Design an enzyme around this catalytic site. Sequence first.
Site, PDB file in Angstrom:
ATOM      1  N   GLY A  52       1.043  -1.191  -0.075  1.00 40.09           N
ATOM      2  CA  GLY A  52      -0.023  -0.070  -0.076  1.00 40.09           C
ATOM      3  C   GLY A  52       1.088   1.013  -0.134  1.00 40.09           C
ATOM      4  O   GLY A  52       1.342   1.868   1.066  1.00 40.09           O
ATOM      5  N   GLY A  53       1.551   1.287  -1.152  1.00 41.39           N
ATOM      6  CA  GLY A  53       2.864   1.876  -1.662  1.00 41.39           C
ATOM      7  C   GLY A  53       3.285   2.955  -0.940  1.00 41.39           C
ATOM      8  O   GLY A  53       4.319   3.156  -0.806  1.00 41.39           O
ATOM      9  N   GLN A  54       2.407   3.924  -0.312  1.00 39.13           N
ATOM     10  CA  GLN A  54       2.644   5.150   0.554  1.00 39.13           C
ATOM     11  C   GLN A  54       3.792   5.698   0.516  1.00 39.13           C
ATOM     12  O   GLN A  54       4.789   5.057   0.632  1.00 39.13           O
ATOM     13  N   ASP A  55       3.976   6.946   0.370  1.00 40.12           N
ATOM     14  CA  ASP A  55       5.296   7.508  -0.326  1.00 40.12           C
ATOM     15  C   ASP A  55       6.425   7.372   0.636  1.00 40.12           C
ATOM     16  O   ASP A  55       7.553   7.051  -0.272  1.00 40.12           O
ATOM     17  N   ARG A  58       7.352   4.429  -0.114  1.00 45.35           N
ATOM     18  CA  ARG A  58       7.545   4.589  -1.621  1.00 45.35           C
ATOM     19  C   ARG A  58       8.894   4.443  -1.960  1.00 45.35           C
ATOM     20  O   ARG A  58       9.587   3.895  -2.768  1.00 45.35           O
TER      21      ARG A  58
END
Lengths: 159, 272, 123, 139, 604
Positions: A52-55, A58
Amino acid sequence: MRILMVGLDGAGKTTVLYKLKLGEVITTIPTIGFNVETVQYKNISFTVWDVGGQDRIRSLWRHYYRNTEGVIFVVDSNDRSRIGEAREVMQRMLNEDELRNAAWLVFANKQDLPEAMSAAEITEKLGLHSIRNRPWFIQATCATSGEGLYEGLEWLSNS
Amino acid sequence: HLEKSAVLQEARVFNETPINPRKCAHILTKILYLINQGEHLGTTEATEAFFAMTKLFQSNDPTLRRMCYLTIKEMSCIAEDVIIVTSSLTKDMTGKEDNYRGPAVRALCQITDSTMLQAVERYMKQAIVDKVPSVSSSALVSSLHLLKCSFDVVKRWVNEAQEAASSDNIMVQYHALGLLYHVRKNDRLAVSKMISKFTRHGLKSPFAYCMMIRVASKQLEEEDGSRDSPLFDFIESCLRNKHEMVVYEAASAIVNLPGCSAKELAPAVSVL
Amino acid sequence: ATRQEIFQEQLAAVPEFQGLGPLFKSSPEPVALTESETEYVIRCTKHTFSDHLVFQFDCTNTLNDQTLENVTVQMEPTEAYEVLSYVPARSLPYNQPGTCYTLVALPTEDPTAVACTFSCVMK
Amino acid sequence: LYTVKAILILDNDGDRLFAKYYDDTYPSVKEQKAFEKNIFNKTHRTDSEIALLEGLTVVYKSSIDLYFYVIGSSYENELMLMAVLNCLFDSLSQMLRKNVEKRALLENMEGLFLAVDEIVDGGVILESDPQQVVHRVAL
Amino acid sequence: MPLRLDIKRKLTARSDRVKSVDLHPTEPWMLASLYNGSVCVWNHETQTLVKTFEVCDLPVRAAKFVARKNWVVTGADDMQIRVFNYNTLERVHMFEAHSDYIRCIAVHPTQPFILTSSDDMLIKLWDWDKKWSCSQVFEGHTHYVMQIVINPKDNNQFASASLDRTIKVWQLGSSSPNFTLEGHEKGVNCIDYYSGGDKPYLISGADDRLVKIWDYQNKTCVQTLEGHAQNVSCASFHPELPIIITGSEDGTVRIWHSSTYRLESTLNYGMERVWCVASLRGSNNVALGYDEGSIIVKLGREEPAMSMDANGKIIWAKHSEVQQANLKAMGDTEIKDGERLPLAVKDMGSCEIYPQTIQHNPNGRFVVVCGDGEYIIYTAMALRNKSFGSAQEFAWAHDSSEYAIRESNSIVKIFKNFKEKKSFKPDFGAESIYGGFLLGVRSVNGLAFYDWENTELIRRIEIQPKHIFWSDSGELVCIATEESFFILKYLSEKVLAAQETHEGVTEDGIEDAFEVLGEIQEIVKTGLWVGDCFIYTSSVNRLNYYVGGEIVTIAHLDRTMYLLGYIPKDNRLYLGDKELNIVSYSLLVSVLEYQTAVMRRDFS
């Protein structure tokens, strides 16, 4: 096989994942505190990393390396917005170079009625035909249908 | 008996495909040993560990879980990242037993960021409410560090305290108060009411009696007026108990040169 | 030119005066002008000179909530004094004396002219 | 109330192989050890009802071959503290069903560590009821 | 904690086993379905029947009002759907949807839909705009469909209960649930939703006497509750307060606090079993079908606790059941009478006791707040507890420096600074106590006047009222007493003499104290002293002030409300709702005064 399923939190990747994996889903937010999951398919033993890639992460999503060999790249098909350009290219290229040692199978999600702008334009834009390169598939899905899922895995379970 | 440098490389082998739960468990023990006697620590080494530890998580194995907590717990004031953990954390939380949950909070508390907090508050609400005290107890201690860090927002929570304020486990009864006091001790007043609050009240996991004593005196001490009606109530009670220490506790303090009421003290004393 | 004179002088470092004199006697009792540990806490002391009376105001703008700014002191009188001025403690932060003053000149040969109650409003 | 300034697990031979310094105030690992030298050594092989060093409370269970320690401030209640001192002492004992030795420790190193964390966690005593505990854990 | 609370036996009927109830919000009408087979619609307010319909004479299981639609939906177990336009009760249409006993309808409100569950082990969706199409059929059954509820929150997603014990929650893209979960160990009678959108709970019912809470987002049984006295026919979410309503197969009410979860109370209208429930969405009035009849109860306060400093901060606490943690409001800006305004943000507080009174100190300052039955007084800026104790009844010594109390016995003790004032110590029959300048003890359907230092029966007037407001300086005082109202003079001197002379009447009080100036026959929504002017609300929603022999309506208000506060300087009134939008209308006090003075001959 460390197979990385990528995309953001909020995608509803996760939804898919457990839909497949467990049969049943979970919220349209991909994970915040990861997935590592194991699946046997075709009785072959697989590790799913779901992001939930989230920066911040990320940025660090590279964060790990060893034993890498396969990509589900979930991208949301109908995503008219975050999909291409600098971001897309960058991610792809970086990933590619870094782990030229793993097939990249991109997953296009919630296709519903597709709310993209041309299947053709994009695939090209991604340089899908820059191919002369690793086993590739460009694959369509709307999650609810799961418009191409089993092949992805299947075709994959090819050797 | 054994040495760190080699080990430091070798620990990652568990992280290497290697299946043999035992082996790694042991190796982990050593690390901890190095650590226990005394060990340098640092980031690089950590970071590499960060990827290393992380994959290893299809383990079901409960005990396996234990091990993890400990390690993580090791990282606190020198802690590195949390987001990964979130999912993990969540996993303890939804996680069936109770158990898993307590360790996680426990590392978390020196280390963390305001922000997430909100979220995790909810979880707190839950902990706060659960009947098997333990975890709830686990929850509390963390807070303290969070108080270290801060804990003020923790304050906001007073309300929960109340819902909680009903208690029936002795130790537990004890724990609540400790916090509380801190809280009100920034405040005379309430406390005065608190006293009243307990006043209707006797105490479950005693211990409670004792902190309260120090306390009960502590207002009075400065001349929180009337020894006479209040104090005394306490005292007969105090006196009465087979919590001889409590009796003592009162006794010791009242050290009064003229004998405030010299007499009684002598019985207590006789008894002493 | 009492103990209180020393205070006449202590007061003297300020120069916004509108008369003073030398202090005659000072206050028989300092008054807390804000009661017990208020949002702001005042204890006040009053000083008499042969010519003027100064109320100099001692204090701990209490709450750490606040610092009071734009501070001056109103006094409004019943039994005479000529009212020259009300003083502003430019700023008052928490737990801290600062000074504000209020000043009067004292009429002496009138029937009813130096005992007074003055009404206070903090702004 | 954060009672354990520190806790130490000690040889007969006046050494410490476990200590978790609940709070440090004179630094280092080192500095703890010197202290051991005085203190342990001196005490060694013999205990007290009460013992003090300078307004601090000195607590601990022994074995013929092994030493247990807790430190707190002598400024407060013997009994509870004892009760605790024991609580640990027993629990483990009971738990173990054995007298720890030098042997005990090598015999299983893990258990100590594990043990160490559960009751007290840096300083305060979270966990207890040793039988309970004992049962409570096993995993 | 106490029932010092609103419970009203709002409306009653004794009847049969009234199975079903359905609410008309849009006009608080209620629809009920009976085990008779006759269904009736009532305006409860005056116990009046809006319409009744004999839809069938077989027990009629299901009912809806379709408000948007302006029509009322009905079904009986002739397996047909009969429609009325409720706009008479003119019957629009009929057709056979579900061919078996039709248990429940759930409706999409946003979207034009009627969802039905029926015992045929079928859920059908029918589209009204399509003119009752069976648009879609939802199936995944194992038994009769006993209940449907729409998660209206996500209208869109809904949940289903069956007594084969399982619950299916569905997605449109699942004409089947998304999943089924294995709820009951009995059967899942019922499924219900959690009022808030924020979090999510269901309660489901069983007679097994165990309750499980579930969080959907996680997807857990949050917890499972026990304690009970008899098969819970039903248990419900209080949507107003955090409490749990439990209901039984004998029609037992037990309440557990949905926060204490402690049995707050048991009530018996042993009207036997909880057949139905329906609740005010405004979360305050609810009705349930019982056998012996049904009863409806009214359960609310009309306000939060707040009191306003004339700087301009109405500090309230809470919101409605939110923590007290939220007080403040000095604002910062100006705008037009009709138009609306902005608030500041900086909570203080996070009390526990739940109040229902706020009253300022006489200088705004010290508020004494009562709640849970005890009084916390705050040092406010301080955010300090100024003080506490348990009440029964109250008067501030108006002066702003003493206070009186009525002990939950009924016999007076008064405290000034925690000193009892016994110089004054009648303890006569009362009713309520009134402070102010002049002491009231309201007793024996009389209002009796007392000194402030010793008691004196100054006067007694005819009856008892409800409320007193005193002019400011006391002088002319306003007492609210149902419809009717009076304005008075209190004349001192007489007393001084009389007192000196001593010999008096006090049965009546002494006829040589007060005078009856004039009376307005009055209904008050809220009311005000501007000085001695009575500026008042009426509950007829005109804001009027009685002025000059005149009562004038400055303006008439939506429906009537609460008087925000007129900060005189500004000369405006801040008007207040209870929903935290403030409106202001300026007057100018002087004008009134100008009038006051001149009549008084202070023309100049």
